[PDB]
Amino acid sequence: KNHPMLMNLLK
Amino acid sequence: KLSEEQQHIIAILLDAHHKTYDPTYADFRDFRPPVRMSPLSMLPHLADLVSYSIQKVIGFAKMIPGFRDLTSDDQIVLLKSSAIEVIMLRSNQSFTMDDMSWDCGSQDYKYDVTDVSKAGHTLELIEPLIKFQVGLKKLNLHEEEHVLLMAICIVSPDRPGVQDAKLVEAIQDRLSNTLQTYIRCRHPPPGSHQLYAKMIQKLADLRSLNEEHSKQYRSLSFQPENSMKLTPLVLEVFGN
Ligand SMILES: C=C1[C@H](O)CC(=C/C=C2\CCC[C@]3(C)[C@@H]([C@H](C)CCCC(C)(C)O)CC[C@@H]23)C[C@H]1O
Numbered sequence: 001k002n003h004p005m006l007m008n009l010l011k
Numbered sequence: 012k013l014s015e016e017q018q019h020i021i022a023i024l025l026d027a028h029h030k031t032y033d034p035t036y037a038d039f040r041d042f043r044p045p046v047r048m049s050p051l052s053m054l055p056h057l058a059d060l061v062s063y064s065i066q067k068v069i070g071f072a073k074m075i076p077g078f079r080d081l082t083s084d085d086q087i088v089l090l091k092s093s094a095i096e097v098i099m100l101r102s103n104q105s106f107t108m109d110d111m112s113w114d115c116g117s118q119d120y121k122y123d124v125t126d127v128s129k130a131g132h133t134l135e136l137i138e139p140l141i142k143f144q145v146g147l148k149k150l151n152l153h154e155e156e157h158v159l160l161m162a163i164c165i166v167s168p169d170r171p172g173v174q175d176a177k178l179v180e181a182i183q184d185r186l187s188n189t190l191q192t193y194i195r196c197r198h199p200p201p202g203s204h205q206l207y208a209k210m211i212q213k214l215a216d217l218r219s220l221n222e223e224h225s226k227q228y229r230s231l232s233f234q235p236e237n238s239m240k241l242t243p244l245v246l247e248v249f250g251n
């Protein structure tokens with residue numbers, strides 16, 4: 001939830 | 012005995028750690044330089060090391076069996092709450108009893124109590140951080156046990172905000188049972204004595220280390236002049 005960089009590194 | 016599945020898990024976690032942990036520390040040349048001249052002198056350097064270390068912990072986490080069956084939101088909750096803990100655990104590999112420091116290959120990249128103070132933290136964190144490192148070092152873990160401990164720490168069902176706790180528990184259980192069973196079959200006495208329970212104790216020490224760090228981090232980061240010295244990834248992951 002508003003964690004664009006973490007979500008990117010996780011994809 | 013140690014099942015085929017359990018042997019597979021350990022092989023996976025070893026490989027994942029090796030891909031995400033360079034024991035030469037070659038990438039440390041990309042970090043803002045260290046300065047040990049100067050309040051918060053070491054903050055740029057250590058902010059960068061942690062930001063890198065965050066990325067590497069994510070790259071480890073992704074390769075944990077089961078981790079990806081988790082929703083993206085749960086993956087996020089688990090990494091956000093465990094990141095500092097896994098950086099503390101993974102740092103034990105560079106940490107040396109010889110002089111109570113993290114030894115990353117060269118004098119430039121060797122960090123002690125004073126360095127961590129020059130990054131905005133106090134002894135209320137650093138002292139029990141060093142003692143943790145010493146207690147973890149004394150266990151003399153097999154690399155297999157090390158990678159399983161980091162994995163078990165990432166996949167903890169109790170972290171607040173976890174929607175699908177039962178799936179997180181089942182994933183963790185597979186790793187916990189792999190670890191109990193590995194200690195029994197491959198870790199000879201006396202080093203194996205209560206070793207599991209001493210490993211889980213370290214997970215409890217990490218909760219307390221996490222809390223303290225979160226609180227010193229809040230105080231550090233509220234000051235917009237220090238938050239300027241951090242990275243965007245450290246800001247998103249630890250908070251803003
Ligand atoms: C690659 C690695 C690890 O990922 C991290 C390494 C060391 C870890 C350290 C040594 C210096 C002090 C560190 C960074 C601690 C320090 C309190 C983190 C501070 C982060 C901040 C943003 C300033 O709050 C945590 C872990 C400690 C070296 C090496 O073993």
Ligand SMILES: CCN(CC)c1ccc2ccc(=O)oc2c1
Nearest residue numbers: 022023024025026027028029030
């Ligand atoms: C040889 C390919 N790579 C990544 C460089 C690695 C790195 C570390 C390990 C560690 C263990 C393992 O079983 O395989 C590995 C492969």
